[PDB]
């Protein structure tokens, strides 16, 4: 079966993808980085969302693995000692698949992308002045730092650092969360964070400036003439290669209490 | 078609009760408190959770329908002026049927009960103490004032006071959030609120004490020597009688921003 | 000089306690639980809280020192292990001494009350409703789950729980959380703490029901036909014996980060 | 007595500020805008903000006035159709004086400044970490979007959007508040908010990048090579003209509350 791998690019990393390789020349197995069917990160969160991005063109086509070389990852969730465990059970497609939701961003003067964690808008200099749109209905006049909208495996990230709900990802859904809401008896947003179902389409229209900081995951872009940003979920998903039981709610756990 | 109606019991309500009920006379349509298929709750959101707790039994063969007397309400979205209009349109199944979930508390020492709005835990005393548990997964040791569990149409209600997200009711699924928790260098929790879909049991367990101030909706009950609370997604679902659009999300903007 | 010992109560407190006085006993020095100058708590904060309020009577007349025989405490600020260094070093007035501001609470149907920690305000029933005063100007109208008054020492306490900010006790204030307010399009809070200086009256009054839950500090008492409570920052102190820097920020710091 | 007169610089304030200066042409009193002794803002906070700044090497020869021409203002609390009767009153020293405290903000590679409402520190790319530590003592290391360290008239602003409390501007002391901080089991910050008496200082420094986007009220400035950011209450204040009692809780009910 055709296999990539990334890898951080410390010393840990690197050898640790050179002994996985060794490990699957010994198998009916060939590593090719056009068209693989598995993508193995190694590394953290952020080496992750990378490799994620890397293909994001073949989502259907790919089973996602990761390996934690530090602390443990939400994506990233084996350990290297049990790097030559995992070798040997992807040898014969000894796993099933989990898949994941993603969110669609449009940017409107079309550019499109897939994030994994979120998407988020910011102003330019300048103060952040957006109309909130949900089904052609407006909601809402945002005057603030900025707008998250995160997908459920996303809520774990910046989501969570904004006062977000933690989802579980086998909800199809996005969660929308205020950054530093302006908030007085004329101005006046929602407060809460809000969580939209499939097909539920969020549009963050201009009332002023028209120039934003849209960043996707990792990815950073000023985006000039701006006339719609759109949210929704998205029809694609990321698919995971799973071996053991890792529960969500345990992999919380193990992040964030003990 | 067999119908009844609940009035809040001020003279605005039960006049205009009188008066829908002598609309209703002239349609082939009879009042029946034991068997209705269409129940009318006069009044306000209160006025609306009592209809439902009334008619729990009968929750499949039910299309419930609010007016609200005063200021808007979740449950009861039809204003008084119109419903004379209402009283027509109802004479002949002119309507669609729209379904919210429902959230089932089961409390060990087995009671159970349905919520529409939430279920909450408190302690009597007396410090709150309580393991959560996750599908059978020990997940976080809570220390605080309690701890709220709520249904999507319930997140417009407590849930939001106590910061958590607005969840559209077509997402089958609950929401727990914390009550002023204790967290220090000892203690934790995940401070989050946690969003669960149907099938996941959040378990709550005692520590030492085993007596709780228990709520369901507006009824509060204090429950002795408990083993056991258990929350999860209702296979049950209140129905609707739906005459117009009236989206969730307008809903919310009219209620909270203007 | 003058002292007593209180203890926790179990024995690694007792037996603690049980030491010191034989090591006070080789000095100019007289157990005396009536009038002393002294008052050493072994134990908790709970323990140091009961020693205060125990002779809240005598405020002007005591310097308190807490041990803490778990885990650290802001008010128990001694390990076990150093007690008799504290023995020797009390015995030769060897020490300055630290005042903390205090709250005086009173209700007036008048009782009155000092707090080291908070005082707060919840229902008996039954849905929690005050005008909340600020130097006889009418602020807000408040429907929640209750308020918190908190000092500044009593700000890594409850307050923190809260929402609220930490103050370094040298600030003579107090500070006002809400708990679970409700808000919407006709109910309006602040939301944010407010801090009072000296000589500001912070007054809650009620709007229907006049029996509420009122605490100060560990105290928990049903009040009933109340027809004011009033807050303000007390004329009175608590003093500490201090025999060594233990910063304010590093109690903080040890508390909460590591 | 010598004053001079800002305008935000639309018509109604220009037209506002001749009218004053001709009602000022009336008594013993001459515009100058290098060395005034009264300066009086006509506009929003933002213009009040500005005439602060256009004249702080001067704040202890300088008495502030404000006029709101729009919607009500922290700083700027007559209306425009009181005018008249200001001019009037401020022809024969009708009014005692009022003073807030100040926050200094030293930035080391030094540069100083004074902010009324606040200072605030962010990234330039680029993830956000800094070491923060208060009095000499290392209190935790940050990692988030930013941090805002506010004056008590501040409060009310950006710190307020934050979750920071309200603190009355008689009490000398300063607030951190935090930008969406990173808390997992490894991270770990406060949380809370912190406020600081006067003499206190708290000190922000780098842990790998030195390049940070620093904004001292409406200034905002990328500042390079980065040393150090100190925080403190300044020794300056500033002198407000009084006519009538406005107290500031009333100020916050009615720009907040109704
Ligand atoms: N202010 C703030 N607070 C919280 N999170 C933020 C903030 N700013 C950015 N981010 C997050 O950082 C990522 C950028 O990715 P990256 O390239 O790694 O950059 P970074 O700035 O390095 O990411 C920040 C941290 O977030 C972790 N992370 C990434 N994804 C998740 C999820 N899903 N749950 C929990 N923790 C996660 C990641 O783990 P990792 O250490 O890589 O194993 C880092 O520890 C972005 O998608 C945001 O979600
Ligand atoms: N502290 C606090 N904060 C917020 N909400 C609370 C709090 N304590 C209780 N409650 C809520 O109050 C209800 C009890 O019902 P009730 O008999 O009406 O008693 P109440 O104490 O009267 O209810 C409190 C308010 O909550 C409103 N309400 C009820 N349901 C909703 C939903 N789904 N969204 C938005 N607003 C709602 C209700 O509307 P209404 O005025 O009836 O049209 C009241 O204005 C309970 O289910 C909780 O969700
Ligand atoms: N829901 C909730 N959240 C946070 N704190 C609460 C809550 N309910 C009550 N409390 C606090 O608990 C105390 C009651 O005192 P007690 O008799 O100990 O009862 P408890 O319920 O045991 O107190 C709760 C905890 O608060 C600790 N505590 C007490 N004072 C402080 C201060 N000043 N800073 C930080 N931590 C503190 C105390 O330390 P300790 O363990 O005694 O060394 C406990 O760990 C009360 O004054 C409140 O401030
Ligand atoms: N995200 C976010 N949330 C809240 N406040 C922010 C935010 N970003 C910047 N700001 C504040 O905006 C100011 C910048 O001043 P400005 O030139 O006016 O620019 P702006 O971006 O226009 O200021 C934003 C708003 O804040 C108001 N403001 C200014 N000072 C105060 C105080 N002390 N209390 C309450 N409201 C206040 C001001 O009133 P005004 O309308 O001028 O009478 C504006 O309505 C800065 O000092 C911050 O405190």
Redesign the pocket.
């Known amino acids: 079966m055709k296999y990539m791998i990334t890898s951080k690019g410390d010393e840990k990393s690197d050898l640790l993808r050179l002994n996985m390789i060794a490990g699957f020349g010994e198998y009916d197995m060939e590593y090719d980085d056009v068209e693989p069917e598995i993508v193995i990160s190694i590394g953290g969160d952020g080496t992750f969302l990378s490799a994620f991005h890397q293909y994001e063109e073949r989502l259907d086509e790919i089973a996602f693995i990761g390996i934690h070389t530090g602390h443990l990852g939400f994506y990233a969730d084996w350990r290297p000692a049990e790097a030559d465990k995992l070798v040997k059970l992807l040898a014969k497609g000894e796993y099933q698949k989990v898949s994941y939701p993603l969110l669609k961003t449009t940017v409107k003067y079309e550019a499109t992308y897939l994030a994994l964690n979120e998407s988020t808008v910011k102003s330019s200099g300048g103060?952040?002045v957006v109309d909130v749109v949900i089904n052609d209905i407006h909601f809402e006049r945002f005057?603030?730092?900025?707008l998250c909208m995160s997908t459920p495996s996303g809520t774990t990230a910046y989501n969570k650092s904004l006062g977000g709900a933690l989802m579980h990802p086998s909800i199809e859904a996005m969660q929308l969360t205020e950054?530093?809401?302006?908030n007085?008896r004329?101005?006046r947003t929602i407060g809460s964070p809000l969580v939209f179902p499939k097909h539920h389409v969020v549009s963050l229209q201009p009332v002023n400036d028209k120039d934003f900081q849209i960043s996707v995951d990792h990815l950073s872009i000023l985006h000039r003439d701006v006339q719609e940003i759109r949210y929704e979920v998205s029809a694609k998903k990321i698919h995971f290669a799973r071996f053991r039981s890792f529960p969500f709610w345990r992999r919380v756990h193990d992040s964030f209490i003990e």
Do not use: C, L, W
């Open positions: 103060p952040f005057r603030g730092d900025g950054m530093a809401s302006i007085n004329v101005y």
